[PDB]
Design a protein around this ligand. Structure first.
Ligand SMILES: [Ca+2]
Ligand SMILES: [Ca+2]
Ligand SMILES: [Ca+2]
Ligand SMILES: [Ca+2]
Lengths: 19, 146
């Protein structure tokens, strides 16, 4: 699965959302 | 051809936001996730985020709209300051090394609990240098792998 890489991407998602 | 593992990953991501499991992500739930990561969006700012992908006009985000959101906003790759921003989320005590304990806590805080065996597996796979923790270089490097 690579749960950690997946969660990092989700964290980046929220960074990109909060402009 | 979507794999079931891909689908499972989308579902997990969706469920992290959709904490009450009703099939829609609200401003409250979007907010909750971003506040768990230190951000402070306003309700209007959260609504604006929803609006962008809110194709059926109902004011909340459903599964296919969330897929669109990720398509647009998981647009390729972690630059540098954002990779570094992510590292900071996990390195809770700011010491430059992510411990197993740190990772477990941060992950629980996000809202995905996993067996300590799983957490240790994540540390161990990323720990290239052998100290049992994950430094920035190793955090960066784990992001390239399959
Ligand atoms: Ca919900
Ligand atoms: Ca909608
Ligand atoms: Ca630390
Ligand atoms: Ca290490």
């Amino acid at each position: 699965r690579k749960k950690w890489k997946q969660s990092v991407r989700l964290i980046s998602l929220c960074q990109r959302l909060s402009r | 051809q979507l794999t079931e593992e891909q689908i499972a990953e989308f579902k997990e991501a969706f469920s992290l936001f959709d904490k009450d499991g009703d099939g829609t992500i609200t401003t409250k739930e979007l907010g909750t996730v971003m506040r768990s990561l230190g951000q402070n969006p306003t309700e209007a700012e959260l609504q604006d985020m929803i609006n962008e992908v809110d194709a059926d006009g109902n004011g909340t985000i459903d599964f296919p709209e969330f897929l669109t959101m990720m398509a647009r906003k998981m647009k390729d790759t972690d630059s540098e300051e954002e990779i570094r921003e992510a590292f900071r989320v996990f390195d809770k005590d700011g010491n430059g090394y992510i411990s197993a304990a740190e990772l477990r806590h941060v992950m629980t805080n996000l809202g995905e609990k996993l067996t300590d065996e799983e957490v240790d597996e994540m540390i161990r796979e990323a720990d290239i240098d052998g100290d049992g923790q994950v430094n920035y270089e190793e955090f960066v490097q784990m992001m390239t792998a399959k």
